[PDB]
Write a protein that binds this ligand. Structure first.
Ligand SMILES: CC(=O)N[C@H]1[C@@H](OP(=O)(O)OP(=O)(O)OC[C@H]2O[C@@H](n3ccc(=O)[nH]c3=O)[C@H](O)[C@@H]2O)O[C@H](C(=O)O)[C@@H](O)[C@@H]1NC(C)=O
Ligand SMILES: CC(=O)N[C@H]1[C@@H](OP(=O)(O)OP(=O)(O)OC[C@H]2O[C@@H](n3ccc(=O)[nH]c3=O)[C@H](O)[C@@H]2O)O[C@H](C(=O)O)[C@@H](O)[C@@H]1NC(C)=O
Ligand SMILES: O=c1ccn([C@@H]2O[C@H](COP(=O)(O)OP(=O)(O)O)[C@@H](O)[C@H]2O)c(=O)[nH]1
Ligand SMILES: O=c1ccn([C@@H]2O[C@H](COP(=O)(O)OP(=O)(O)O)[C@@H](O)[C@H]2O)c(=O)[nH]1
Ligand SMILES: [Cl-]
Ligand SMILES: [Cl-]
Lengths: 360, 362
């Protein structure tokens, strides 16, 4: 009998936790407690993932969201701690690299509760980025580090973290892709409702703060996607912050010139990803998923944490400096492909994690 | 020209800030803002330090204290971010390794405000200590790391922190002792008041969570000091956390078997330290201060961050497993001296810090 308490806050964490929860569910002598920090609150950012991915209802929802870093983090720290004091888990699992992730780790470590980091050791090497700080501080607060890549392992060793607390387990998001592919296949009619042809479109997601808070970068991107749309339709589930920023800066018309959508659930997303001729993104999960389905990817950033995708030629960096340049880069890359290679493990990262926990 | 905001919360942070602030006041094109988190709030833990050490009143008093790690840290995080969004300083200075330190660094780093850590790189290698977490995360959040010892430099290098963000400046608490030494001698009457001669007592402080939150460890300590007291008087300024714990555990009667005091001010503390035959402590700062005055030290812990003191034989660990043994260790070490050696620098650590903050560049 071991109690594993998972802290999730964001869309990409709900998806990671869905792979790990399934395994821990069906593990003998494990009880899972699941805390939702409230970081993502809208149904199309949260509840749709609990439904379609068959994720047990949270034991707690802390309903903390939409504030500053200080506010969100500070309140998550107090609220999570209150729950940890009540539930007394053997392990706390935190996922990815949001304020939720860091609050979870920090609440736990002060209570002497072992912390494991699912997706550990990724580095952008840009310490100005809030997500890089969250990655570093979470890894340094954690007791176990579940690395998805060799790079991530080397990143952790370089910062003095001992071999014996690092387990290279692959990526749980590959697990989720594998497990949920069939259900996506039978439930999603998004190509239908969108009148899209398999391989008859490009899929875009953009929501990095460094791309959306900056008017000139955001303009370069929305201009580039509208141009690209002249040649091949662009489907664009628009993050809510991205949509806020584009409206605020007067760039809302570029959204009208492509096939812009509200955020979609995981099953639609899998189907849009699978059937895309090419994926343009600044998302971590989406750039790996592009590779899952062997769709060429362009990453609209100056760097990625997922360097093996660049080495394998499945992914290509295009910083948003020039709208025409960005447009051509996207159009050129859609008739490329990368090498045959298996990354991210066998789709059993979650049971490797289960195993290492109930042992350690 | 440049605005530098210090975050402080607890006694040892007001002493460190005293030393640094004095220098920054002399520096041209340097405005300071001091945020007192409210972590320490009793007058004998906060106000007395501002007064005797000549520190200007805090620009802000957040009045946070007395909660859990979660509550204190969380509330401090949100509150400090508020001040920073108003003040928009060029630097945030954080000190040591309390919950206030961490909350200061976390508030700042997410606002893209450069953080410098005064007293960076110390490691106990014991994560159960909240303090060990606070200094790991603070160091990893910081843009400048003011390390007091080579060990601390080596700690930071080992954790992947680049050499160009690390500066070995020595310890601003040596600067503090050096600068306030004459004032303490001139003004303190604590010896007169207690009726102590020089070398006629042992000084004790205890306040680690690991020593006070555990009934039987605390009993071991209080009992050991009572025994020591029978052979050489024990003076014991008692931390409010320690008193509170001693009371709740029913251990208060032990404090009557030594010369138990409320916390004393820095000036009185110098005089007590300086004239003690031996210091026994679980304090960080008191360990170094014992060495400043060449008084043997016993550290009632399983480890210290100040390892150089063990190597020079000025300090000795004595984890509290047994009262008889701990007493005997204390009495035995009263007769010892370390090796002559200069540590902690030249007493101008603050000047080095000031210089780096000014010349670091945008
Ligand atoms: C740059 C960065 O730090 N990123 C971190 C960030 O993730 P991320 O950038 O992937 O955000 P995100 O794109 O919202 O999610 C994608 C998922 O949403 C699905 N997705 C996407 C759009 C959509 O409409 N519907 C949908 O189902 C996709 O199919 C996909 O499964 O938060 C993550 C977390 O803390 O767990 C970190 O692991 C990441 N760190 C890394 C290193 O990749
Ligand atoms: C073990 C540990 O983590 N310790 C950390 C902790 O300090 P510390 O353990 O020294 O607490 P503490 O003993 O209350 O203060 C001593 C001072 O009070 C004076 N003092 C003491 C008693 C008294 O009655 N009067 C008086 O003036 C003394 O004369 C002396 O100058 O908080 C510090 C901070 O965050 O800045 C960190 O730098 C420390 N890290 C280290 C590594 O030493
Ligand atoms: O359900 C949600 C979640 C987020 N957002 C918007 O997205 C922003 C960024 O949210 P997030 O929690 O992802 O912040 P990050 O982790 O990127 O700092 C929020 O301030 C909101 O404007 C929203 O509108 N609805
Ligand atoms: O001026 C003060 C500061 C603290 N405390 C008590 O000491 C405890 C510990 O304070 P803190 O969390 O700052 O830790 P510490 O001072 O022991 O490092 C608090 O919870 C209070 O009960 C007090 O009585 N007076
Ligand atoms: Cl998105
Ligand atoms: Cl004390």
């Amino acid at each position: 009998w071991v109690k594993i308490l998972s802290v999730v806050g964001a869309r990409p964490q709900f998806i990671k936790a869905a792979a790990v929860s399934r395994v821990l569910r069906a593990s003998p002598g494990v009880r899972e407690v699941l805390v939702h920090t409230g970081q993502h609150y809208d149904d199309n950012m949260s509840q749709v993932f609990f439904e379609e991915l068959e994720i047990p209802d949270p034991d707690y929802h802390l309903g903390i969201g939409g504030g500053t870093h200080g506010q969100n983090t500070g309140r998550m720290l107090e609220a999570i701690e209150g729950v940890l004091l009540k539930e007394k888990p053997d392990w706390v699992l935190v996922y990815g690299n949001t304020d939720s992730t860091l609050a979870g780790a920090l609440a736990a470590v002060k209570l002497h509760i072992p912390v494991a980091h699912v997706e550990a050791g990724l580095r952008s090497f840009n310490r100005r980025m809030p997500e890089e700080i969250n990655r570093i501080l979470t890894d340094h607060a954690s007791d176990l580090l579940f690395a998805p890549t060799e790079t991530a392992v080397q990143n952790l060793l370089r910062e003095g973290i001992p071999e014996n607390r690092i387990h290279l387990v692959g990526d749980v998001m590959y697990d989720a892709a594998l497990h949920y592919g069939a259900k996506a296949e039978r439930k999603s009619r998004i190509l239908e409702r969108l009148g899209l042809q398999a391989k008859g479109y490009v899929l875009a997601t953009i929501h990095r703060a460094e791309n959306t808070d900056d008017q000139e970068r955001l303009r370069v991107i929305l201009e580039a996607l509208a141009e690209v749309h002249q040649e091949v339709p662009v489907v664009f589930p628009v993050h809510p912050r991205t949509r806020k920023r584009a409206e605020a800066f007067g760039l809302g018309s570029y959204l009208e010139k492509v096939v812009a959508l509200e955020p979609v659930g995981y099953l639609d997303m899998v189907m849009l990803e699978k059937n895309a001729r090419l994926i343009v993104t600044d998302s971590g999960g989406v750039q790996k998923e592009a590779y899952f389905y062997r769709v060429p990817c362009v990453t609209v950033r100056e760097e990625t944490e997922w360097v093996e995708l660049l080495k394998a030629e499945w992914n290509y960096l295009a910083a948003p400096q020039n709208a025409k340049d960005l447009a051509l880069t996207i159009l050129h890359r859609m008739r490329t492909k990368g090498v045959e290679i298996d990354l991210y493990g066998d789709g059993r990262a979650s049971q490797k994690i289960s195993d290492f926990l109930r042992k350690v």
